[model samples]
Target: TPDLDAIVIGAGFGGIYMLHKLRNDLGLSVRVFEKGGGVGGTWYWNKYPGAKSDTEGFVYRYSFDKELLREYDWTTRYLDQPDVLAYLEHVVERYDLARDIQLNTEVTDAIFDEETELWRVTTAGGETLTARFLVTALGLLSRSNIPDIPGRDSFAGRLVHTNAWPEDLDITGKRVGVIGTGSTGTQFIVAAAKMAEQLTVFQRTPQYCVPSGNGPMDPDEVARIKQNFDSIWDQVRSSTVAFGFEESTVEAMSVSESERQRVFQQAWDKGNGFRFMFGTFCDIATNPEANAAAAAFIRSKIAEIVKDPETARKLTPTDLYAKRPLCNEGYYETYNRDNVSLVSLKETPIEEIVPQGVRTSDGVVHELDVLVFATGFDAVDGNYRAMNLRGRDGRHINEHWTEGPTSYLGVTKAGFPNMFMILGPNGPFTNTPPSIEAQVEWISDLIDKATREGLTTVEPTADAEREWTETCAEIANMTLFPKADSWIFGANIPGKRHAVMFYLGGLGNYRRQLADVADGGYRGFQLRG
Candidate 1:
């Protein structure tokens, strides 16, 4: 049946489940191509120190497998890269997924064939295969966005990007210089400050990081989780951020001043960025007065923690607390260490990357033995831009996304027939596993119906894509997220069109919309044999 029923790219949580559901459940012939040597997608490559999930460990995993969910145990409150990688590896072994997964095989090109109604896929090795459906699970934050800094090649120290961290490299007892202050940068800063003899952090945009409250998972809590597994998943599916907590419905300003402070304090003590933003008060991301109160609390905390008044001032963020909420322990306190230094790029701009280290415009060369780019990713549509994706009428993906990336329900594009994406542009912005699972399951059902009805072609109409894009924009602009120049809007990458790329309407609403679309006989889509 056209060589194979489907060809899925990536081997992360999305790809693994996509393969499992398609081949095992749907009884379709499917093949998964992974660019990395192993699975785990983001976990496979980002082996940097302190690289861990911001989401709680228990809920970060797939919720579909009940037996594995019960039996698979974790020690920590938050899962680090190693733990996630091992867990994914375990899943592969248990499900025998390695047989259908081709590791280290990158898909170089994917061209739609109108005559055969199949996709002609080519690998890096020049081998070609045809498949009825093409699915890409390319992660939202997998594509590394290294800045175009002049003299980057001249850097004499061990230049490393957090995305492709070297296994053999160690920063212990060395003068470590870090660039960028996003989630990754903050994590590495906290970890490296403890180990390095001297740590110089070059701050881009100062972040407002909440405590992660990470530690060993409590035995009693684990038991409680297992007991309420069904209800937990039920709540998770219905919630907004989906971080194993109920998203607050109360407005920040609706409460008395004293009560508001107490609620913020309670959430701060409990520790979780999402909890602080969404659980404490719902309007923190929408109402300006609400956002100001939350931002003020964090700024006050920064003043109290860093010890050095100047460093605290440098670390204080004036922007909205709407960036992908970062959670970590001791991030603020780490700046109090004697060996750690902060360099605000705004005050003293980086002129270029010198052989010695980063040279500031003020003519100071920050000497270092290792330079780490905690620089975040290009995100969402970044990975797609790397490949040669040609749709109907020989239109390249770049042309399709000339203004920016848009899709029908974040799964199918207008011109790309029989193609789907998991966690693609305009997908739900929540704890990633749930979103991934939702997309995978939805795509699986669509394929099942297509196969049953002998529908050889499937694509969203251009009008549908436009309408969906408008909806995403409308929802996103309703929040303070668009106000911040963060990666969420593609503002982090230079020359990239800054626009809304995620559906701000929570996982629950998005899921219902997907159900509505399918129940309406896949409205806004064209089906033909």
Candidate 2:
């Protein structure tokens, strides 16, 4: 017999839930390995000043536990990093999952054995464990991406990356410099601006940000959410974006200019970047005319918000508003403060990181006390590629994913049998929680079937992986998401292949596809005992 039924990597939402389902429901002996001292996955390490979930607090949590959903206490519309971490900890304690998890341990390698069909998982501490199945609950945006700049180590001031924010570090009255203006950077700018003596934002690309509209949740509203959760979850599981809102059926071009502005103004006031993107208009991501109308509205807002024209010009974005739409409170107005400043990296490129601060091409040094790299993640397959994962025939994961990651339904790869992934490459591109639940549950079901049917090995065929990859790419090409040089297509990291890493299909369709494949006797996969 194998030493264990399964070994799971990562103790974030995906890993935690995966462990519960396999251990509790399937009655399998499982162990979870986490690198951090605790759980919470993404929330575990990203303790940055303004770290928060873009998804609504109600929807961002696990949906499987109805009792916990109704009983859990939360006040924020969007959960901050600390609040989310606390909530996840509560879940682990309530479910008694910590005993099965090993914290402060990192998985160094996983090599498959063909003779016994077991996985030899090696840890950083040089201990080896054998298991029949391996599952990687590695998150989509867990890996940090800091650009290769000259003299990075020579910086005299405190250098930090948002991915690994040091605990309890305060920036009050300190001169802080932040590089990269993605979601993390924008959120950090908002928080840092309030306390820092002088805040300088180094922007590579100006973003089209909508208001998050985050505030204290009313008790009555919270009660209503609990009362209507069943229907809410039903809607979430079937929706395109799964943001707990109805996606607009009306095209931007269908309405008059005045009517379009009216709708845009309403959503802008109400808040939520996804609501502004998906609720107000259906074709903004597909039709250029529609996208232009939306982009123009944002530009007009920026012009109205910032007092200085030169500053407004620097902040306004000219690109398509198709990247993961960002939301924040008073991001544009942050520049209105006397202490805040902006540097457009496009116009004034960074020369190097000197002892004092960041130096630009114009021969000027912007001195700072703290330098933060809010540069985003390698995303999707980054963590997987970094690991020493060997499948059958001693084939390396990098060798199999040479042309970028290919998978069948985003859970199973062609070359790796009895190995699964949660929120893997080519999975649904919706709100993460619902997507996470969808993939995790589906993976569990497949594992259950394999165990019950005496199927010793299972994996997608090469042709199936190719077909799914092509399907995802085709769907991505139909939308404006691929048009932007965003991280969704692996464009953020240098030399990484720019390809469709998500399904582009909505949560509803992706779920249906999973069901179809399972119902059709796990079509496109090879199962052998």
Candidate 3:
């Protein structure tokens, strides 16, 4: 058995940074396990055509390192998967992260041994590792969720999932049918349309998409940001969503119709994720009148872009606006191409995949050479479920979360001891990178303190977990987030509970609450020495 102070289960950005902090900063014996051969986490695995980061490359980076940010130069506003992966590889080499990481290892099961107050982590290859603390830096959207469609095996063609695309795979000149119109679908369609001879976009639901306006990073702008890195980092840490932008005070309905249009258009022109939606008005998510106006603006844009009126109408979304804000540079414009076609699954639902192509309920056979499942991940508790984790008294994590994932601040579960989850269920979904940083930092600090104080194990009380879960639910109920059947509320997953899982009360408030608990001598936690 390999003994370590902490065994982190991932070598992604979160895990790499956590290992650095634990080994260098806190002087703990840390070991990182990654399923991939190298680092980069999602970036390492997801190499589909046109895969890129939705967040600006300048901002979507490690803020902890000052010199790294200053020295590194980003070529584009949004980086492709290869560039991002390369960046992570650079960080791994620079920080010597690979030395502490166990590559090509998948953690199969983790069991908390109550007698020893330690976690016995077993790998897929039957290696046993014991650790004082089990830190899961498992990414929120790492688990790929392929739909259980009938006759999938019978289909005769190359099958590819956007999330699980091979690094060297080629799709050029292929007649491709891309399913699911979420962010992944939009991105893949736009990218594939440029390469594929015939690209058919299969849309189950039309999402509200805006231009990403991605371009080369301005040297002046980069320099300006470099000058104020400290202040910029501070602003992000202090804000609600963790983005550097300030929260809007104005409600969407409070503004005049023309002013609202102008605001929405300006946000569209600016191009970023959730920024335009938040900037247009404060109550756009919850307010019906405001949501309708915003939806209309998007529909108008789509109509103007797509030459065919019928296709444009089919693309218009009647669902809640900003359910999941889409950021793309040429997604909408891709439909204007002669080689590209959009198929509304709502009207002509896919029955099954025939030998040649998809067979719709309307009895139309769309032939395709390649089938791409751009369907998103299971998300949130999906990764945890994949791991056969058993807690105290033989309680399995999957069975415990059968009703849905329940936790205190999405970090500590009641029965789980010394198991810290970063960006778990109930964590802020929108501002993921910073949110992840905060969670990992807090967990690291807590574990360091425990080690210093000679604490064997620490777990949240059942009541505390219940209270926090209720608090998260209550906050979600107050917002318009729950109105739409969004992934935020587990709407995308079939038979999954429609409960609001994330802490809707901004990151600033969540951070303060965590601090309060720590300051109050680690309230609601059982710390054993």
Candidate 4:
């Protein structure tokens, strides 16, 4: 195959926009490879019932195209999976992105040719290709995490995972069992309860859910937002979470009980996931008292919504709230339905799946027509591991990541030359779109500069990667985040080491580090001709 300037993996928001930047802005020959038949990345595949943006519609979208922002109208405050996918499709067509993207083509393997300073990328169909640079837009949360349940294969009923839902599948009248009460589980429960004849929610941990408060977009509100698209974009670019919310001022414990309740109620009514922490003075993530207050508020809300005393207690979380803030339209209400049932995994652990149904620790079996695993992704290093990537001296990326993901700026690895990761490890744990955009912009700028100077490859040094990894760890350890068994640090995945996967300081600080490195003549990276 002819040598191209760059080969981007995945055509999600990051990949499509990166391609646009590389081709239109940098004027480079770029090709995009997507395993799925179409674009939209995670949105294209995760079309489970009630799958909607946790971030508000206005914030979830791309801010790069001013006209697109002004022209396209959002129907709901939080758009569902189909609508989000449709919006991405519209963007693809509007920008003519499809021409450069190859759908249903998975990049099986990519090997760096150190001698030639290029990448030999191979597709699943024995196709060999070469590119000067390899940029992976493999999304942060694209990889599905399905637990190895005992007798999973023997289960007679239809099995499904939230991440890999079938495109044309329907579950009407079916007795569905949904496992894991994370964000996806909450969304699935609401929709599944409405559709299924009997919906069994197997929850290991009860999540703190806030009403999405989604409704039809008001014309005036839409117009007002459209008019101030530039300002909104600027705000998102500058803010930590990329959402339009006032920064947290008063600590959780600093305010009076009445005042805290008022603030919580207002945020709940306003709608959006991050509102819970936006106005809190002290970091709830680190302060135990702050976390307890937030958790108590959510528990109170759950008790208010769920009518049944036993069910309400089951729904209420004992752990720190806002650790994984769930966004749902009608999740708690769904429990009120006669068809919906909650199975607390902590009380009665899942033993195995018999041919007929799921058996619990207490030796009780609940028959189900279908099983849905809402288990989230392996996260940060999953995609990179999935590809079985081998770097310098035949070093396996997966094996290296067993101690957890370590990278400098989350973009470049110590030994991987001309290999860039968009929204990679140690990235901001907020709205991924803006984070991806920031990384892509930085990469593009660096690449353009390198190309202009006749540089063929740029790789970060081992010392730099080690130091940056430590920095990431230090910042993450400062917060209460490290205490929770969250996927942020690969804690959910058994056998995976507990290392800080994201640089949690802030986006501005991260960007500054990148800028400083560049200002120091790209101190961390080794440039080659």
Candidate 5:
């Protein structure tokens, strides 16, 4: 372990925090490798039209420094890509985080040496760096998934995937066809509906869209929250999803019909995504009747907004809402524009991408000058699989997860000693920043403990990982998540095995469990020098 104390992969929020903790606090030699030329992580790459944070900027930030809270000012409730990227850069500069960080460097592989009790990491340029700990800070959603559509390469038009948007894109007067109606597609269409000459949205699956209600942040609210920063962070860690929103104590069925309708209708009209679901009733996500009521309410709103009856039906989602609820601005209203067209792929599936445009199963070819793929990533463990990581027993990481990813506390892998994954599979599905910060802080404490206690390797046991995976599934099954076919359960990729990938157990529960693990001298982990 001569080279460094840790080799952190992915220079996102998680990675930056890890470096700050290790280098600044623990005084350990740390090296960070970001695939992007600079920091920003997902914010660095996703520069697609109308790309912005669904989570508000106030909550989607660092909590380690109270000084930082009062210093940086966010113009909007939800910051755009440029502002977010700038915020990240500002963080790096303020903390002097770039000292040991190597940008434009992609980690090729990290192989463990049992004898040395160290991880040998090799980057793309044949650069080798050995470290005691190999930490992967790869954000949960950073891995981009481009579908192997037929004639994808044969497209004659200007093709762009929203995940990796080009620096300079001009579609001002061009006919644009955006395929996929997820969060990214919804955002893109909102912007493109006005910009593109004739915009056609190819919808594969209907999404439950809620109004973002995003606007100028009230300085009064910001000051109030910042003044009570300690309480706010405490609430965030203890909350269900960690979005700084209150979890409803009232069940959907607790009140009279009139009260329930009034409550739900009010939340819906106010237009916050998470508030509409968890903030309204605690049982909407778990109870079938409550869920149905919520769904029915959402569809009624869609019907109200979408002037066309057939279009409203086409746009409404009929499935269980296990996926991260999407909030957008003018997405539904965009369909009503004369220049914007909505093509439901469920009714007539996309046959192939023709040079002219897309040809549906109905033999109708929609001509377009530009093709935009708004399809999202292969969620959870996609990037880890791509990184040719080999564990202590020389088993390829991909081989270990041929079926799906299984880890202890969604942080430690059994065979991968001294290796940790931030926002890993089976981790709590919460406001990403707080959850990620929790994991980073936990790992930093673990590493600090190992350093002080003279420990060389610390990894989860086989029984512990198995038990954790089962526990994750058990929690997921407790709710109505099993009934849904969303990416939260690894249902997005074709060959990817479907499993309950997220810890449906709330953030408060997950945080307490992490504390318990530490309190019990890091039980379930084999710590040895």
Candidate 6:
């Protein structure tokens, strides 16, 4: 293979957009390598039943082209896997990016050549390629986490992982068991309830989930939204979480008790997910009284939905709100069905996976024809760790992040020159596609400037990395995000260390900071030939 101007890994929202900007805008030769045999990074891989995006489908798309946005119409407020995949196909085809992308190719390692100030990237199939700049667009949550069940191999029946749902998989009338009740587990169980002869959900943790008023989009409403796309996107870009929401101006405590219920009631009826939490109260994520108020309101909904008190009690979450808030139309109602059963692992702890089924501590076994694992991912650093990447002094990327991840502006680090991360750690945890677009555009501009200036390397300084890392930690400490043991900090994975994985300083604020750094001659970044 020949050397190139740039090599982009992982053909997701980030990689595809990076190719477009670099090749079309900057006129640089770039190649994209994707492990999947097609486009649509997460949509391609996670094809499980009821697989849909948490971000509202319409707002969760690319903003580079107004023509494409007008042409595309999402059938529902939230689309399932197939529609998402088809949309991605349209994007690549629209941009004429097929030839530049290499599907079914996995990047194994990236080693920086100190003397040449370039990157030698190796693929899984023993292909070696070099590039002036290496871009890792592997996404924030790429690596799936499946637990080591004791008798996993001995199970004589079918088994499925939510992360890698098979294309031909069908479970029409089989006895199904779903383990773990994260977002995936909740969606799958709701969809599987009507189909399975008997559905068993073994839940270890009770996550707080809001109702996703997912339904068919009103064509008139869609047209109206499309007409106001410019203004809507402006609001999204400037907002803290970067979605179609605003932080409540009214304080929860300032309002009277009756007025508070009315406010919460309205948000609940609206059927929005995170909007119900952050959009309702300004201090819900900070004030204990406010967080408790939000949690209580959702708990009341569970009591009203579930007929049985014990069942409702089992499903109810008592933790701080907004720790991966779930939203579904029929998720709560599914528990009312005769076939669906909920097993609290906290009460009857899982002993092991016997040949017959999962045996509990009290010797009670939940027999099933099929088992499912909705266990989440080793997020933030999992994909980067999978690739045994090394930078200056041959210091492994994982070794440097062994004390948990620390990246300057969540793009370029101190040791990795001419290397960039898209949606990397400490980046905004808001709407992923827009955040992805922001990073790709910044890095592309930096690369173009470097090429024009005859600069060989661009990396952050040690002092800058420390400052950004501390800033991320300080902002996170002021909220309820780190309080819950969620996957945001790799807390769901066993033996994984916990740290502040995202910069909660809002998307608009982060964007301003990025602009300020560049205006100040890229203060933290060292550009040297």
lDDT of 6: 0.86
- Model 6 per-residue lDDT tens digits across residues 280-354: 888888888998998998899899999978889999987778586678777888999999888999998888887
Worst 10 residues of 6 by lDDT: 240-249
Candidate 1 backbone collisions, by pair = none
lDDT of each: 0.91, 0.91, 0.83, 0.83, 0.86, 0.86
Ten contiguous residues minimizing lDDT sum, candidate 5: 267-276
Off by over 4 Å in 1: none
Give the range of the ten consecutive residues with the poorest summed lDDT in model 2. Answer: 398-407
Q: By descending TM-score, how would the candidates be arranged?
A: 2, 1, 6, 5, 3, 4
Q: What clash count does candidate 3 reach?
A: 1
Q: How close is candidate 6 to the true structure, as a TM-score?
A: 0.98
- Candidate 3, residue 507: CA error in Å? 1.8
Better of 2 and 4 by lDDT: 2
**Pairs that collide, model 2:** none
Give the backbone clash total of model 1: 0
Give the least accurate 10-residue stretch of model 3, judged by summed lDDT: 240-249
**Model 5 stretches with alpha carbons more than 4 Å out:** none
* All candidates: CA RMSD (Å): 0.9, 0.8, 1.5, 1.6, 1.3, 1.3
lDDT of 1 by residue, 1-529 (tens): 4789999999999999999999999999999999888899999998899999989898999998999988888888999899999999999998889999999999999999877788988999889898999999999988888888988999988998999998889898999999988889998888899899999999978988989989898888888888788898999999988899988889989889999999999999888889999999889999999999999999999998889899999999998888888889889999889999999999998999989888988899999989999988989998899999999999889998877888999989999999999998999999989888889999999999999999989899999999999999999989999988988998888798988899999999999999999999899999997
